Amino acid sequence: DSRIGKLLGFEWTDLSSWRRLVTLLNRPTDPASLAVFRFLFGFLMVLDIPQERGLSSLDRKYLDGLDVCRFPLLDALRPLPLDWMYLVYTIMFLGALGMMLGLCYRISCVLFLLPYWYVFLLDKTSWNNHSYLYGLLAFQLTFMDANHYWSVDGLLNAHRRNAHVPLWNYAVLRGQIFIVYFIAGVKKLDADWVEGYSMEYLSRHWLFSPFKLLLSEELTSLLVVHWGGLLLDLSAGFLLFFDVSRSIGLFFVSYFHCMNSQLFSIGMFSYVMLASSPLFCSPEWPRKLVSYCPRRLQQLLPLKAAPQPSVSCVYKRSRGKSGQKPGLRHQLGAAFTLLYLLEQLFLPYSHFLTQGYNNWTNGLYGYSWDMMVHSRSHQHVKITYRDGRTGELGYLNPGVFTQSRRWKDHADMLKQYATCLSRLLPKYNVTEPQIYFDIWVSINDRFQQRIFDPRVDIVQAAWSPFQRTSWVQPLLMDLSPWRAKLQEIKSSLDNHTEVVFIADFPGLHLENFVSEDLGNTSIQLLQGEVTVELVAEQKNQTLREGEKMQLPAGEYHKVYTTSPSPSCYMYVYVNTTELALEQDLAYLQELKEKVENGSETGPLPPELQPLLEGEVKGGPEPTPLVQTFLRRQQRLQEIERRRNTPFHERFFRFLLRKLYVFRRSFLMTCISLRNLILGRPSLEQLAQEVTYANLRPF
Template identity: 50%
Template sequence: MKLCSSSWYRRLKMAISLRTTISFDNIIYLLHEPRDSASLAVWRVLFGLIILIDIPQERGMASISSRWSDPHRCNFPLFHFLAPLPVDWMYVVYLLMCLGALGLMFGFLYRLSCLTFLLTYWYVYLLDKSVWNNHSYLYGLLGLQFLFIDANRCWSVDGLIRPSIRNSHVPLWNYALIRFQIFIVYFIAGLKKLDKDWITGYSMDNLALNWIFDPFRLFLTNEQIDLYIVHIGGLMLDLMIGFLLYFDKTRPVAAFFCVSFHAMNSQMFQIGMFPYTMLVSILMFCYADWPRQLFKRLPQVCHIVLPLNTPLQCSKHCLYQESDSQQQLDSHQQPDEVISPIRKSHKQKRKSKEEVIIKRTNNETESTIYLKHRIIFGVLLAYSLTQVILPYSHFVTKGYNNWTNGLYGYSWDMMVHSWSSQHIKITFVDNKTGEVGYITPGVHLWEGASERWSAHGDMLKQYAMCLADHLKDHNIHNTQLYFDVWRSLNGRFQQRMWNPKVDIVAADWSPFNQSSFLMPLLSELSPWRIKFEEIEDSLDNHTTVVFVADFPGLHLENFVDPNLGNTSIQVLKGSVVVEITDYKENITLHEGGSIQVPSGKFHIVHTVSDEPSCYMYLTVNTTDVAIRKKFNDFKEIRNSNESSLSEFSSKELQIFKDLLEHEKLIEEYRNMTLFDRFRDFYETKFSLFASSFNSAFQAVHNIANSASFRH
């Protein structure tokens, strides 16, 4: 009995001690502990530089004139009251964004620069949902963090102007916030990859064909690379890398895999500066004084151009323990080793110039927790919870869900869902006259717009309302609009995404309710993807296949391009009726049945079975086959007499010339060295910079002279 009582007492004492240790006050003290600001300064400089490089291309500065010059174009803002400024003023917005990023990078008028960058960046970001992606959202979050952290306390212009903040401490929460954000990006991306499609290798297709995987082809097939390296490897990396970066012993291993992963991504995907941002973020998990330690190890001659290594000052934003403050500061900061560029011998030569003096007076430091510290803790906690909950907010924002859950752009579901669009048809009906007509998909959008609007109910509704307004210019004031959109998710059947019988203009849409016009994903047909692979492997290089599934009672109207001289339909499941409109002929097909459809003609495929029908189009581009055959003959005889080329027409010779140029470009790209790729990257960025800023300065000149950019 005594043993039990003693054991219970020890456990109670341990619990009380643990509770005391992890009290809110101790957490607040921990978050406000002083840390070296050197690593934060490097992060500030590199992030500012990355954003400056990113603005002309990924942020769209180079395409302002084509994107925002027409005020009558359809746009997709998050809030209806947001609208683009006149094109000249849009250039001013981007110039302010650049100036904000430049000020952030140099630490000049730091808070004002951060606020300028933040306001302009989020304005442009919220102005067009059709270009949202995860890393653009991440840049906005990091910009918000820079506004509140003390990243100008080291190696900044502000520090030169204001000696009171020069080379001073920053509270630990400055680092903890950034590390947490990067951890969330990796970890939630890993959780999202626990999707069945990702684990079974259907999310990313044919990535193994990229040259970056050449070393793996020595011992793995392309299918194995796609499954084990891309999918399983990507899943494990995202789930584990955030944890590995936090610990000293595992950080070198994590850094190796991070560098490899993002270097490969930079070559495989067109995702701007995101891989380089994530590469730089690795440094934030190292000790806060790593730049000083690095500078210490450089030759003495390098110290002339290195940032000044002045003593660390205490900061009013940090909390210093009263009892053993100096001892704790020494253990955390090691100022004599961190600050001094060269360790002196025991003779202490020139000691007055090189010993570290840390200014500590009662007026300069704080050791008591005040309301402001508790507010900071509360804001950090609220922000962290938001970042954890928001990617799973689809149960609230149901209107933004389609076949996948989650708000697009900031769900961290990077590369989990691959989409392909096969067919989009827009039909309008004039309610007054009964006239039926068709609208070209993408009309009244800027020329570089993607088809993402067709996959999200909110943007589909916005586009429908915009088209209805434009139809009024053609004296059609009361109209109905129907969208027939066929898409495939992760290699499934091409199927309808929206109900083609619902008038989108009249349909209700709310961010908190599921779109009433969304058709369900035929997920029960997902196992057919195994059969798809078998069929595709059995085809030659000239034959393409499209797998289609449709709902009972609906039909697909299709037109066969004249170049596709050999096109057939084969039923895989269910029953269909194929209507050849020009011939006024109907053919019923059941499972296993097939029919060849004429090229250059319309036909309609009606689903007449009680279950969804599944069929495939097999097409051979006979024109392309003939051209390729002649092209091979041309290459065999092109070095012979000129007269031997007389059998080819001038049009064919021009096609052959274009094909040869295309083959040459492919060969040159394959043979590019690392230096060539870097030069190509540099030349592209420089060209975008030059054109962007030339146009921006012209816009400023126009505003100053009350001229128009168009003129």
């Protein structure tokens, strides 16, 4: 009767004692919306396993005999052989199907949960917010009685057919979605989001075309893209709860998720959030929807009758009987709800404890809900090794013995990579090495700067999870406002010239080798004091503010920083070989046009004849310039043909590609299950079956 009781759904007096709280958190509630969400989540995970979890690509990620540097959270964990991995993914698929159909619900939830987290914890490079959310949702649904309506288990068991469920099943899910929205919103209260730096280039998508009718691009990239996301996060947190604002909240959230689905390649996360939005509605919407259909549909859709009493709820007895004393499962449910929501609130802000994982950002990516807030651009990665026997110094391929590229941003992954290199290099005639790393990275369009100390042997470096790393360079936030001026310098260049901005610590130096192609390269000092050394003649010159030097092309040079503070400078260079090739190609095209339009009546040179003919047959091999011209023309024609493609063909190719992925996954799984069960046949049969599996559907 009270307005507060109507708005929030409970009275204050319900919270006066523990017993009343348990009764409130285990009141009867209709099961329909929970069942619909269970079905949708199961279907989306079933579609997601062969696509993003990597079942199709698993034959080339855990291949036996290959030497790879893994990145598991615990060093004890190691992958199983490939066949057992396919068995694990098969168990995942069966669990997802069981969750979707509601057949043996608890067993199916366990069979989906344990393998999913085994795969999740095995590799830190595949972590991301929408996989963590799927894991959490699978964890929650393991305990919820979501098979009480529209489930096969109901048909096989009368006691669980259209039965009541306790309220906390809905409360935990609503709390999870609210925490996602609110934590994402507050995490976006950052200087790089409110000022237009993160996601600066996404306003050019054609989906934002109508907004440009009333706003300029610079405002459209700030008011709509950035501030709109923050406001929608907070409001969609709050609006969906109350009855007054549910319709507008649903509309805005649906538009937001559809645009996120189209703009990004996040995957099934937009559809999962769309499926989670209706839960804030009344618990009985599927039942009234089923009621509002003709009788013929009602003979196939689920039941419409009122749900029956259950045993997992505390029932208030109005017959004069004493109220049902809460047992154990109700108290356990209430405690689980409270503790789980408290833990979910606390975990995103638990970065002051695990300081070993801290970096320029906070903690490992995946469980902070800071989506599309930081954008990184790497310039150079140099890996040096010194042999422990002869003393030779050598350089490694930067991405050697690795499958991801997130190790350039985390100290722990760097340490694991260093240990892997230490164990693996003795196969390549290298004794106990000392490995040094030199990585340059810029976050949100700042000066490119070192992230790790290049003078520290990472193999023998000290790292522990709960202590700050002493060999991670601080991020210079004092140089942030320069991002204004640098942008102006970016707009003052020609169509050929390019610019790279560098900031360096005192004491350190950068050694560089300008390639012979990059002629007419110059270095200019913006702030601080540096000295540029040419090693060809061993000559070093000290550069003050606003001074420019013309560097040699094809030689080594060094820049040393010799100021109390960090020094910022810039390389401005132009590629001479590409320019000369472009001029020659333009000249050749001009001669071709003169030949075609009737001018240049004189006989063509022999080297030009292949251009008119277009085919090298019965003649000398073409010169490199002719080959480049023909390749460019063919590429341009191919691109032009690709642009002129009707929509239906693109849709058909999309469907065929997806069908190919699904078929390949299924066939490889069947082959390996046969290998596990009946043993491994001869090599020729394996080759034949693998050839059959990879065949395109056509």
